[PDB]
Amino acid sequence: MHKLIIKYNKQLKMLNLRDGKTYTISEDERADITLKSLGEVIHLEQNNQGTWQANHTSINKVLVRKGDLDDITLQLYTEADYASFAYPSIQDTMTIGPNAYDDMVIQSLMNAIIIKDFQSIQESQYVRIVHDKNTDVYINYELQEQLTNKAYIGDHIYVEGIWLEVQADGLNVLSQNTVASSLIRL
Ligand SMILES: [Cl-]
Known part of the structure; x- marks a missing residue:
């Protein structure tokens, strides 16, 4: 790939x-x-x-x-940059950022983003991504205006150099930098 x-x-x-x-x-x-x-x-x-x-x-x-x-x-x-992570089992929020406390830690990120509402994804078919005004987030390659955006299963997110793909059981990720996480790697 x-x-x-x-x-x-x-x-x-x-x-x-x-x-x-x-x-x-x-x-x-x-x-x-x-x-x-x-x-x-x-x-x-x-x-x-x-x-x-x-x-x-x-x-x-x-x-x-x-x-x-x-x-x-x-x-x-390339496939060398690919990884898959399962959504948290019980918490309803998940963060990706450069902080030691983020669920998925990627040092190259300037700011962290929040992925939430995945606990009801089987029914809604989407998750919400929250970012600050200084962070550009693209969903299916379109720059988002609002700070909180819906991302449906199958949608692709791009933020600060990393690619994400929303799935029913978690997220697929493409990152050229190492990803440290407390989440289960699928
Ligand atoms: Cl894509």
């Missing part, structure tokens, strides 16, 4: 890079990924050893190229 997250001027995009294929990120509406006022064209393809590159530069974990209105950040995740 090679999932590329593209960030530019608070816009967020995603591509699942597949072996042997080529992609384009540009202002063109026909491109694989279209970003308005990008001012650059980025071709994604593998070198001869199969390593993904952006305009012939290996991406590795993260690659940044300046664009018209902001830096364009490409973050590439």
Whole structure:
């Protein structure tokens, strides 16, 4: 698996890079990924050893190229960054953040977020994510305005470099940095 997250001027995009294929990120509406006022064209393809590159530069974990209105950040995740965690058995809140007391501790995070209401997820089909005004949260690659947002089963969340996928029994996560947790790893 090679999932590329593209960030530019608070816009967020995603591509699942597949072996042997080529992609384009540009202002063109026909491109694989279209970003308005990008001012650059980025071709994604593998070198001869199969390593993904952006305009012939290996991406590795993260690659940044300046664009018209902001830096364009490409973050590439692989199965090595994947983990699954079960929701707490009885508490109805769960936190992900850089603090020693967060349920899922990830040092690279600037602020923590709260995931709640999963105890009734079998019935509602969603959880709520709470964040502060200084934390950008995207749900299915759309920046959220409100501080508390609903995330249904199957939805993808992106916040401060980490990807989350809401499921009935817990969360799937993609993080390039180690995750320490008191939660059960599924
Ligand atoms: Cl996704």
